[PDB]
Every structure is written in structure tokens, then in C-alpha cells.
Amino acid sequence: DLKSLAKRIYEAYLKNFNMNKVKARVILSGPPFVIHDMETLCMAEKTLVAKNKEAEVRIFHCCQCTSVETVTELTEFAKAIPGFANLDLNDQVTLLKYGVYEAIFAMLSSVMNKDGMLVAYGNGFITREFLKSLRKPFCDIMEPKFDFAMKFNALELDDSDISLFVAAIICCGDRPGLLNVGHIEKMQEGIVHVLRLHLQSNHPDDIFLFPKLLQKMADLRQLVTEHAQLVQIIKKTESDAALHPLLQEIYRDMY
Amino acid sequence: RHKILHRLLQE
Numbered sequence A: 001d002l003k004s005l006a007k008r009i010y011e012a013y014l015k016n017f018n019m020n021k022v023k024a025r026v027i028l029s030g031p032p033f034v035i036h037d038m039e040t041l042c043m044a045e046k047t048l049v050a051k052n053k054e055a056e057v058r059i060f061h062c063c064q065c066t067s068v069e070t071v072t073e074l075t076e077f078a079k080a081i082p083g084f085a086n087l088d089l090n091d092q093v094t095l096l097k098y099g100v101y102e103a104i105f106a107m108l109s110s111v112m113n114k115d116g117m118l119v120a121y122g123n124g125f126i127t128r129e130f131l132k133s134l135r136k137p138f139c140d141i142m143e144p145k146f147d148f149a150m151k152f153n154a155l156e157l158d159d160s161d162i163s164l165f166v167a168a169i170i171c172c173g174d175r176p177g178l179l180n181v182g183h184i185e186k187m188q189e190g191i192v193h194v195l196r197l198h199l200q201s202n203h204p205d206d207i208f209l210f211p212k213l214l215q216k217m218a219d220l221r222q223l224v225t226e227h228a229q230l231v232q233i234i235k236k237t238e239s240d241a242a243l244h245p246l247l248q249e250i251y252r253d254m255y
Numbered sequence B: 001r002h003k004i005l006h007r008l009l010q011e
Ligand SMILES: CC(C)(Sc1ccc(CCN(CCCCC2CCCCC2)C(=O)NC2CCCCC2)cc1)C(=O)O
Pocket: A019, A035, A041, A044, A045, A048, A049, A059, A060, A062, A063, A064, A066, A067, A070, A104, A107, A108, A118, A119, A120, A124, A141, A231, A247
């Protein structure tokens, strides 16, 4: 039932993520509150966030809360991938541990354009330049993500493609410390098989789109490797930037 | 070692 493995994964994607590509493009076309300077950030915090430090530290805390929620949605999505709930609980944990941020930065592309990113459930839009304006090390977090996203978005994927791509990212048989490698590789084989057939049908004019996407998965691995290095730096050198517990679990010992 | 995530997974 290949056409139904795809549909099951797509359905699980639409069920579990608040933000997706069709919703983001509707908003990014035609109004989110633009955050482009310190004044608008403060106004946005008044109107979009309920409950005092440097601007950069407040942005970092809001971002963490968001990542905590995305990690939670991705866990629910993962449990809905055929076979995943059958793996060993340790392997489930290992697959999400290394997979979530690859998935998060793929999906972040959906809400990014070259000028900024849609944030807060579609209700704000932060300019890329404002984020560059922040002081080090916080002006370094988002930029490499915009760079990745501009290359990713040029592939013109839709949510049916992205759902399978994210499933393939999560079902990766070469993560450090997997116990039952063969069981994961067999799952991934089927997802990737369905992804190749789905792209062939959904994008019949890009004959290299499947290997283009495999390469993006390796690009996202490097992107997360570097991201985890910037986070480790932040966690040493910034007194006010402690990680939410679930995020500490995920980053501890990562790369 | 991944207490919260393990909790999430078993729900
Ligand atoms: C927190 C670290 C340590 S670094 C990190 C990681 C991820 C992100 C992107 C967070 N974000 C902006 C959240 C913007 C909040 C906004 C700020 C201004 C005032 C109003 C509220 C956002 O919209 N994420 C989408 C969510 C939908 C699905 C795709 C991802 C930023 C930094 C982590 O790595 O976890």
C-alpha cells in the first residue's frame, strides 16, 4: 500500500503540526505584525507573549519555548509513522534526539522568505536584518538557517513532499547508538521508496529532485552539527540562557 | 537519561 503509506504520513503531518507550508504561503502573500527594530519587538512582546532582560535573551527564551512545542509535535508525528512505535524505546529516543532539529530546520524553511520569518502561529514576521542586528552570539543562530531555507525553498516542495521528507529524516539508520540498526534501515528503505515515487509523480519536471533531496538531508545534518556547537557556546558563555529541560535532554551529548 | 522524551513516547 505505497500510496497509503504516503497518505498516512501526510495525514499525520497535517494532524500534528500547527504551521505548514500552505498556511504560511497564504499569510506571506496577502497581516502579521512586523518585528524589524527594538520598538516593534517590545510591542510584539506586549501583544503576542504573556509574561525584562536584554532583547537577545528574551528572544532566545521565546525561541526555546517554541522549540519545546515543535519537539513535542515531532514526537507525535514520529509515533504515527508506520513501524516507529514498534521499535525499541531507546531507539525511538535516539532517532528523535538526532532527528528533531534536522526536521525543525527543514520545516522552518516553509515560514521563511529572503526578508524574514513568519513567527508566533502566523501572527508576527521577524525580519532577517533585525536578527542580524542582534549582538553576538545571537545574531549567528538564525542566519545559516535562512541560507539553507533559500536553497531548500527553491525546490518548490509542498506539504505532501515535506511530510515524507521529515519522515525519512527521522527514520535514519546511522544515528549514534542505535541498537536495532536493521529494523530502522528497513523502515527508512520503505519511506524513501515512497518518497522517490511520490516526487516522480508530484514533480514530473525535475528529474533530479530525489537525489537533490537526499543531498539536503546531509546538508541538514551538517547544519544541526554546527547549530549544536553554537548552542554549546551559548550555554557556557551566557548566564541568562539556560535550556528548557526537554531541550537539555536533546542537546546533551549530541555532537 | 532522556526522561521527558521517554515520557512523551510512551503516551
Ligand atoms: C532555542 C534554541 C536553543 S536555538 C533556536 C531554534 C529554533 C528557532 C526558531 C524558533 N522559532 C521562532 C520563535 C519566535 C518567537 C517570537 C520572537 C519575538 C517576539 C514574539 C515571539 C520558530 O518560529 N520555529 C518554527 C516553529 C514552527 C515549526 C518550525 C520551526 C530559533 C532559535 C534551539 O535550538 O532550540
